[PDB]
Design an enzyme around this catalytic site. Structure first.
Site, PDB file in Angstrom:
ATOM      1  N   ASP B  25       0.661  -1.257   0.234  1.00 61.00           N
ATOM      2  CA  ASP B  25       0.080  -0.124   0.097  1.00 61.00           C
ATOM      3  C   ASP B  25       0.831   1.494   0.013  1.00 61.00           C
ATOM      4  O   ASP B  25       1.119   1.750   1.189  1.00 61.00           O
ATOM      5  CB  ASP B  25      -0.990  -0.013   1.195  1.00 61.00           C
ATOM      6  CG  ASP B  25      -1.869   1.004   1.106  1.00 61.00           C
ATOM      7  OD1 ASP B  25      -1.884   1.795   0.316  1.00 61.00           O
ATOM      8  OD2 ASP B  25      -2.656   1.119   2.099  1.00 61.00           O
ATOM      9  N   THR B  26       0.951   1.828  -1.201  1.00 56.77           N
ATOM     10  CA  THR B  26       1.841   2.902  -1.205  1.00 56.77           C
ATOM     11  C   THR B  26       1.189   4.196  -0.902  1.00 56.77           C
ATOM     12  O   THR B  26       1.852   5.353  -0.494  1.00 56.77           O
ATOM     13  CB  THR B  26       2.092   3.240  -2.961  1.00 56.77           C
ATOM     14  OG1 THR B  26       1.009   3.732  -3.761  1.00 56.77           O
ATOM     15  CG2 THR B  26       2.918   2.286  -3.419  1.00 56.77           C
ATOM     16  N   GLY B  27      -0.182   4.050  -0.517  1.00 55.19           N
ATOM     17  CA  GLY B  27      -0.823   5.175   0.266  1.00 55.19           C
ATOM     18  C   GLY B  27      -0.918   5.371   1.647  1.00 55.19           C
ATOM     19  O   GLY B  27      -1.578   6.109   2.247  1.00 55.19           O
TER      20      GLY B  27
HETATM   21  C1  1UN Z   1      -9.832   5.107  -0.062  1.00 55.10           C
HETATM   22  C2  1UN Z   1     -10.024   3.377  -0.213  1.00 55.10           C
HETATM   23  C3  1UN Z   1     -11.088   2.630  -1.030  1.00 55.10           C
HETATM   24  O1  1UN Z   1     -11.638   3.774  -1.855  1.00 55.10           O
HETATM   25  C4  1UN Z   1     -11.285   1.559  -1.160  1.00 55.10           C
HETATM   26  C5  1UN Z   1     -10.468   0.617  -0.205  1.00 55.10           C
HETATM   27  C6  1UN Z   1      -9.747   1.368   0.716  1.00 55.10           C
HETATM   28  C7  1UN Z   1      -9.317   2.616   0.856  1.00 55.10           C
HETATM   29  C8  1UN Z   1      -8.334   3.062   1.727  1.00 55.10           C
HETATM   30  O2  1UN Z   1      -8.842   3.967   2.596  1.00 55.10           O
HETATM   31  N1  1UN Z   1      -7.336   2.342   1.922  1.00 55.10           N
HETATM   32  C9  1UN Z   1      -6.233   2.753   2.648  1.00 55.10           C
HETATM   33  C10 1UN Z   1      -5.593   1.465   3.146  1.00 55.10           C
HETATM   34  S1  1UN Z   1      -6.738   0.846   4.699  1.00 55.10           S
HETATM   35  C11 1UN Z   1      -7.773  -0.251   3.985  1.00 55.10           C
HETATM   36  C12 1UN Z   1      -8.931  -0.021   4.699  1.00 55.10           C
HETATM   37  C13 1UN Z   1      -9.697  -0.948   4.444  1.00 55.10           C
HETATM   38  C14 1UN Z   1      -9.388  -1.903   3.157  1.00 55.10           C
HETATM   39  C15 1UN Z   1      -8.373  -1.839   2.549  1.00 55.10           C
HETATM   40  C16 1UN Z   1      -7.409  -1.010   3.055  1.00 55.10           C
HETATM   41  C17 1UN Z   1      -5.308   3.716   1.926  1.00 55.10           C
HETATM   42  O3  1UN Z   1      -4.485   3.046   0.805  1.00 55.10           O
HETATM   43  C18 1UN Z   1      -4.110   4.333   2.714  1.00 55.10           C
HETATM   44  N2  1UN Z   1      -4.807   5.713   3.365  1.00 55.10           N
HETATM   45  C19 1UN Z   1      -4.635   6.564   2.118  1.00 55.10           C
HETATM   46  C20 1UN Z   1      -5.158   7.924   2.569  1.00 55.10           C
HETATM   47  C21 1UN Z   1      -6.733   7.478   2.726  1.00 55.10           C
HETATM   48  C22 1UN Z   1      -6.937   9.322   3.151  1.00 55.10           C
HETATM   49  C23 1UN Z   1      -6.781   9.607   4.591  1.00 55.10           C
HETATM   50  C24 1UN Z   1      -5.092   9.990   4.397  1.00 55.10           C
HETATM   51  C25 1UN Z   1      -4.459   8.514   3.962  1.00 55.10           C
HETATM   52  C26 1UN Z   1      -4.614   7.261   4.665  1.00 55.10           C
HETATM   53  C27 1UN Z   1      -4.036   6.216   4.400  1.00 55.10           C
HETATM   54  C28 1UN Z   1      -4.136   5.046   5.434  1.00 55.10           C
HETATM   55  O4  1UN Z   1      -5.213   4.301   5.674  1.00 55.10           O
HETATM   56  N3  1UN Z   1      -2.905   5.006   6.125  1.00 55.10           N
HETATM   57  C29 1UN Z   1      -2.981   4.041   7.478  1.00 55.10           C
HETATM   58  C30 1UN Z   1      -1.457   4.311   7.835  1.00 55.10           C
HETATM   59  C31 1UN Z   1      -3.680   4.519   8.600  1.00 55.10           C
HETATM   60  C32 1UN Z   1      -2.955   2.532   7.090  1.00 55.10           C
END
Ligand code: 1UN
EC number: 3.4.23.16
Lengths: 99, 99
Positions: B25-27
């Site tokens: 996860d690059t985000g």
């Molecule tokens: C935006 C999104 C979708 O549209 C669909 C599925 C998942 C996500 C999602 O939010 N995924 C996240 C991983 S956490 C995750 C949660 C549930 C399932 C899979 C991954 C992002 O890749 C990363 N996500 C990117 C980004 C999201 C907006 C808020 C700031 C960062 C927070 C960061 C994040 O959560 N970082 C942690 C250190 C807390 C893990």
């Protein structure tokens, strides 16, 4: 180009001919943009991340250029602190992870 | 390897001698794992994502082998839907984004 992960992989995107900074996010299934008043029909949706779900507006077939590469697809709009380019659009620009 | 993004970039990790599936996860700035036991001291931390903030346990200096590549670093444990490998460890394994 190649983008390292020392820092958040932020790139310029263009949507509605408008420029924004957005995060290339392999962990997001969807593309999620900060609140913006985009024209057209939309559908209510909920998406879950760390921390819980948020409500977003689903806009379909929206052109968006990512770091100079043209894409078109579904864009979700809602209260995110960061514009997120998710896998739906990353595939369209031929983006890969490499190690 | 080169990993495309038509599916979630899930890989097998080995941590504390146990196998898990985790998302590249690059985000994500940080690495966050589902509830589990890890040895050594931990400290309470909070981290934020799209749905808000969660409470996690921070373990420092933890060996993890990610798809055959060795990392040793900070691992957060708490309520996540998916095991997430974030930039802190993606950089250690030499991971880049390319298009
Ligand atoms: C935006 C999104 C979708 O549209 C669909 C599925 C998942 C996500 C999602 O939010 N995924 C996240 C991983 S956490 C995750 C949660 C549930 C399932 C899979 C991954 C992002 O890749 C990363 N996500 C990117 C980004 C999201 C907006 C808020 C700031 C960062 C927070 C960061 C994040 O959560 N970082 C942690 C250190 C807390 C893990």
């Amino acid at each position: 180009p190649q983008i390292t992960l020392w820092k958040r992989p932020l790139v310029t995107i263009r949507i509605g001919g408008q420029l924004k900074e957005a995060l290339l996010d392999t962990g997001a299934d969807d593309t999620v943009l900060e609140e913006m008043n985009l024209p057209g029909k939309w559908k209510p949706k909920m998406i879950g991340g760390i921390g819980g779900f948020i409500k977003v507006r689903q806009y379909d077939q929206i052109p968006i250029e990512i770091c100079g590469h043209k894409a078109i697809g579904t864009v979700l709009v809602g209260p995110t602190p960061v514009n997120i380019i998710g896998r739906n659009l990353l595939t369209q620009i031929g983006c890969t992870l490499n190690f």
